[PDB]
Design a protein around this ligand. Structure first.
Ligand SMILES: N#Cc1cn([C@@H]2O[C@H](CO)[C@@H](O)[C@H]2O)c2ncnc(N)c12
Length: 377
């Protein structure tokens, strides 16, 4: 049978197939290579992906996301106590474990995290089946290198619920190394710098005659692209209030429209120096129209960019490594396209240039699909 590769991310998932000797990263039905890991339970319908994410503005308690933060953990774990205070959907204690509670046609309905992750895996499965024109029963699925056995097993259980035999779990650093075709002969020490939408992970990965070992891992579970957007949002909400006597936080729809344009402006500023953020009638009778520069984008986020270096010093200290011991730096996550991030990493490594791809958001799924091909022979 076919074996597909799935990057099951905190904020998004991505599915790849290995076919006639190539990895193809598959578009969802809206033509995107990345699917938001959102599931909504509104008005008797269940939605998965972008349509679910759009429900979050008006139905925040019914729109489930960031389930990867809960999967295989205990309700009283210090990380889960913190996530319950941040997440707007209800999390309950079922026998020591966090479960998600929502309403379906007004009825209280409880889900284990693996049941929500299974709904994301089933959408990625369907994208594969439709593209390949046959049923898919097998998958390689990625996890963070810091996942323990209970987190890996709950990920395998999500696959079983979705009708997927997960024939192999591989860590995100390993998947990145396969995607970039890092040479497997002799011994190489790789720093994998992974800055996504919601989380930051860094690992030291050593490749030794085709054996992959993560020697050390550290990160920041609340530092990613979304934090950079929120800093811009905070600035423009202050400015619009100063100029127009309108506080855009009082209108949830206005906030949703601004967040969309701010995300687009951030992306543009990875290439250009100046971009316009425009919304006709952000509220009735009032247009939003501002310029954001790369310099103001950086000024608003420079403390958060520099915080990424704290886990980097920690993994070097944990592995008793000198900076010069790192043979290469590999960047994964869309947020590594930010020019200031690359510059700060280069400077920390006394001038050594980091390796990036052109699609860092797809590297992990790409490597999962490579592992699928390696397993089929
Ligand atoms: N294409 C693209 C980019 C994606 N991301 C971010 O990666 C995160 C995960 O997808 C998310 O928070 C997103 O906004 C980018 N960030 C900066 N510059 C870019 N050019 C991109």
């Amino acid at each position: 049978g076919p074996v597909i590769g799935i990057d099951l991310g905190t904020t998004y998932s991505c599915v790849g197939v290995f076919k006639n000797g190539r990895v193809e990263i598959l578009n969802n039905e809206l033509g995107n290579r990345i699917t938001p890991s959102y599931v909504s339970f509104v008005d008797g319908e269940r939605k998965v992906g972008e349509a679910a994410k759009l429900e979050a503005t008006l139905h925040p308690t019914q729109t489930v996301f960031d389930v990867k933060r809960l999967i295989g953990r205990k309700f009283d774990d210090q990380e889960v106590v913190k996530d319950r205070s941040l997440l707007p959907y209800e999390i309950v204690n079922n026998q020591g474990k966090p479960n998600i509670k929502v309403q379906i046609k007004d009825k209280d309905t409880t889900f284990a995290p693996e049941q929500i992750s299974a709904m994301v895996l089933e959408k990625m499965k369907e994208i594969a089946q439709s593209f390949l024109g046959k049923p898919v029963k097998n998958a390689v699925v990625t996890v963070p290198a810091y996942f323990n056995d209970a987190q890996r097993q709950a990920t395998k259980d999500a696959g079983t619920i979705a009708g997927l035999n997960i024939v192999r779990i591989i860590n995100e650093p390993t998947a990145a190394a396969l995607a970039y075709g890092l040479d497997k002969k002799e011994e190489t020490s790789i720093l994998v710098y992974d800055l996504g939408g919601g989380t930051f992970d860094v690992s030291i990965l050593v490749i030794d005659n085709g054996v992959f070992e993560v020697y050390a891992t550290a990160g920041n579970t609340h530092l990613g692209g979304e934090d950079f957007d929120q800093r811009v949002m905070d600035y423009f909400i202050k400015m619009f209030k100063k100029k127009n006597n309108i506080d855009l936080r009082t209108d949830k729809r206005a906030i949703q429209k601004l967040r969309k344009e701010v995300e687009i402006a951030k992306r543009n500023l990875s290439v250009v120096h100046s971009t316009q953020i425009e919304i006709e009638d952000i509220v009735e009778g009032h247009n939003f129209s501002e310029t954001l520069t790369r310099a103001k984008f950086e000024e608003l986020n420079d403390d958060l960019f520099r915080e990424t270096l704290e886990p980097v010093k920690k993994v070097l200290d944990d592995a008793k490594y000198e900076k010069s011991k790192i043979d290469e730096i590999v960047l994964v996550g869309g947020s590594t396209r930010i020019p200031k991030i690359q510059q700060i990493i280069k400077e920390f490594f006394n001038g050594k240039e980091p390796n990036r791809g052109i699609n860092p958001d797809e590297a992990v799924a790409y490597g999962a699909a490579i592992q699928a091909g390696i397993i089929l022979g």
